[PDB]
Design a protein around this ligand. Structure first.
Ligand SMILES: Nc1ncnc2c1ncn2[C@@H]1O[C@H](COP(=O)(O)OP(=O)(O)OP(O)(O)=S)[C@@H](O)[C@H]1O
Lengths: 216, 360, 216, 72
């Protein structure tokens, strides 16, 4: 929501509706954690860039902030406050209020359900089958089975869309382009294209692997 | 680690096979073997090809002999094998072409139109002919080269030409046996390499202008390509297997009857080319010479010359027998017309009378 | 997909080339691959560069096929492609230029007026010549190359000088096929790699002082 | 019909028939001449019904070809 505390996310943007661990190691984020438990367990998670500056900065943040409902929050004495967050949807960040701790206000959820939902369900089923194929094939490149288990039995299309988009491994810029896309079908098309690209480089790995035994 | 990791690096620089990049060439000369197979070649050529391709793939680095071997492989594959051209099996189209474009050549186009007719009467278009191959003799620049280009246009097979005059040895008519980087065939093999078909219309330029003294006599090689019973088994010094030269037409040019060598004087059809008379060159300049000076110097519909002034040019600016001198004069008129027009166009269409000629 | 898989080839084999036992390539196959397929030069450069990939992945020390891959790549890339200087198309400009650069016999000036006045009439939806090429005859001491650089400055074009009194074969002006370094390409592509635009004036010095010493 | 608050006259209409304008009365406001109806009723309705079914199937294919260009 608005004027909620900001936690910079660790090394990757956390996409909504996936049970993910979020590390809180710096004290400037710990102060915003202490403030966010005073905000009815709702945190406006705004991620920073890939080079993590040791202190959060009012210029290194991202333009999309996700609102997360905290299922449970355990504290650890090692120095890291690992919080279990189950996020809801992306929201735009209007501007940056400097800290530390940082503040950034948002708006209502940017996820929308447009017309022609039969095509939406067809694309959800097609992307589910394609991601099942991607998970079943990429055993050599370490794709897990609990990630495939946690995407079955979904009510909203955004559930499966954001959970599958998190459960495949790629860069941060493609995820940012996905979270820029508020359309329900364009995100599915982007994930399908990225999965095809990964499977094709995967095929390229077996091509070089055949010519391994050839030219040995 | 220095040995094993480098060996695995060798495994990588072969095992990637350049993948998408390796798709072309298939790891350096797999595709050249593919192109040996793709070009329909004689069997002795293919045996030489596969044999010396087995002489290839032998650690090319540290061996320029493998480089000239792959060079020889390229020549073998690049040389056209089993690639033809459509022809015209009629004499009528050559009548309409050499009545059309080249102003009749005064009568002697019919003495050419008998030779092409006799050549297309030979049944099956067989290898044996026992026949001449149409030498052209005449003073320079009288349309003989464009005569051959016209004859090939009527033929609807591509014209070619090679200025073979001034060559002192057989070493670039047959080439030489390969021994280093920079090994090269004869000029004829260069010629038919830049002609992508196996049946061109080849025009020799200066057989009578050949020179002899050292490094073997090329007159053997021209005799060997000369006879149609002999050019079919023309072999090289660069290449090995005799090349088939039956389908390849050989129009030839020269300039002097009495300095073509004796093995190349017999079995030849002598055509003494004439030179269009003053008024005939006037007619030439009116429609196919000064209009091309206009069309290439970019002044269509923006200049003209009276034809008595063209008489003044031919009578006063060109005493050569051909048209190349008149071509140069009309080019100079085209250039000074371009200057006198780009000085400010005083007329929408200029007028060159006989007066101001030493001003243009 | 072809470009990204070849980029995967770039990424894997730039991680591979750092530790090579083939060192005269200097690991610069992927370093110069930035202008193989991330190149803003035409599909001749793209197709040549695709074959350069086949010409990479080779060792060195004596007749290297991969050093000549990168030397050929630079030659193709360094030589300008679809890169042109803005050339002023004026003839009275040259009347001032040849007035400000030379005392002049005022005779040859008329001849370059003839030729350039033809050059003003280059038509046919392109620039095609079928025209003479200005042979200059006279003493060496007379300012001929000064006249040529005057014309080049009058046209806003890059003057060069490569002389042909010093070539004896079609290997100092022609090339050799890129399969070994120690093959060094010819004078015009030397001067064209010198220039950053595809359109220079070139004056040729002493054509008549050439000979056929060796075979060819 | 009704009046929108921003200054727009909004009207919901269904068109009746086509007509041909013979003469133009000068305006503003503009006037048109023509006929009350000049439509053509369907004759030989079997081919018309076949064309209707084929147009329905073609429109279903046209709306089914969209993947990121969705339609109502
Ligand atoms: N019948 C003709 N006789 C002479 N020249 C002609 C004739 N018809 C056209 N030309 C011109 O000849 C020019 C080119 O050919 P020429 O200079 O006559 O000789 P060439 O064919 O170039 O070289 P040759 O004749 O083999 S030494 C062109 O400008 C043509 O317009």
């Amino acid at each position: 929501r608005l004027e909620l505390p900001v936690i910079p996310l660790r090394n990757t943007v956390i996409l909504p509706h996936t049970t993910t661990p979020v590390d809180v190691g710096r004290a400037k984020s710990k102060r915003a954690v202490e403030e966010a438990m005073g905000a009815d367990r709702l945190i406006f998670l705004v991620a920073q860039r890939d080079p993590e500056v040791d202190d959060p900065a009012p210029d290194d943040l991202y333009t999309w902030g996700v609102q997360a409902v905290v299922k449970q929050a355990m504290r650890l004495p090692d120095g890291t406050l690992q919080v279990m967050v189950e996020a809801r949807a992306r929201a735009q960040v209007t501007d940056y209020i400097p800290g530390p701790y940082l503040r950034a206000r948002g708006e209502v959820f940017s996820e929308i359900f447009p017309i022609d939902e039969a095509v939406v369900r067809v694309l959800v089923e097609e992307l589910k089958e394609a991601f099942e194929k991607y998970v079943a094939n990429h055993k050599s490149l370490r794709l897990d089975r609990y990630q495939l288990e946690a995407v079955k039995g979904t009510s909203d299309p955004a559930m499966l869309a954001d959970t599958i988009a998190y459960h495949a491994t790629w860069t941060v810029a493609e995820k940012q382009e996905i979270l820029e896309l508020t359309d329900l079908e364009a995100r599915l098309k982007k994930v399908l294209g990225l999965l095809s690209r990964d499977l094709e480089r995967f095929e390229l790995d077996k091509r070089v692997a055949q010519r391994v035994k050839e030219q040995m | 680690d220095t040995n094993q990791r480098e060996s695995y690096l060798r495994e990588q620089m072969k095992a990637i096979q350049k993948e998408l990049g390796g798709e072309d060439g298939l790891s350096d000369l797999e595709a050249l073997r593919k192109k040996i197979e793709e070009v329909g070649m004689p069997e002795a050529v293919k045996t030489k090809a596969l044999k010396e391709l087995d002489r290839l793939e032998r650690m090319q680095q540290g061996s320029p002999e493998a480089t000239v071997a792959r060079t020889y492989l390229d020549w073998l594959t690049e040389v056209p094998w089993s690639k033809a051209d459509p022809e015209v099996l009629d004499i009528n189209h050559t009548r309409q072409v050499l009545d059309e474009d080249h102003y009749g050549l005064k009568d002697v186009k019919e003495r050419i139109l008998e030779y092409l007719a006799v050549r297309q009467l030979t049944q099956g278009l067989d290898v044996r002919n026992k026949a001449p191959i149409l030498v052209l003799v005449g003073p320079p620049g009288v349309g003989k080269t464009s005569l051959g280009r016209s004859i090939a246009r009527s033929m609807n097979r591509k014209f070619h030409r090679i200025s073979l005059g001034g060559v002192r040895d057989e070493a670039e008519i047959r080439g030489h046996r390969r021994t280093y980087i920079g090994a090269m065939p004869g000029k004829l093999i260069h010629a038919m390499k830049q002609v992508g078909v196996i049946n061109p219309v080849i025009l020799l330029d200066e057989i009578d202008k050949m020179s002899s003294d050292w490094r073997g006599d090329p007159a053997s090689a021209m005799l060997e390509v000369l006879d149609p019973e002999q050019n079919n088994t023309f072999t090289d010094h660069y290449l090995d297997v005799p090349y088939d030269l039956s389908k390849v037409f050989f129009i030839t040019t020269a300039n002097t009857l009495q300095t073509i060598p004796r093995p190349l004087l017999d079995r030849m059809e002598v055509i003494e080319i004439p030179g269009y008379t003053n008024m005939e060159k006037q007619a030439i300049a009116r429609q196919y010479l000064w209009p091309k000076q206009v069309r290439e110097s970019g002044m269509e519909g923006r200049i003209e010359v009276t034809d008595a002034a063209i008489l003044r040019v031919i009578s006063e600016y060109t005493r050569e027998a051909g048209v190349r001198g008149l071509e140069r004069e009309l080019g100079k008129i085209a250039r000074k017309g371009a200057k006198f027009w780009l000085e400010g166009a005083w007329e929408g269409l200029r007028t060159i009378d006989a007066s101001d000629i030493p001003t243009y």
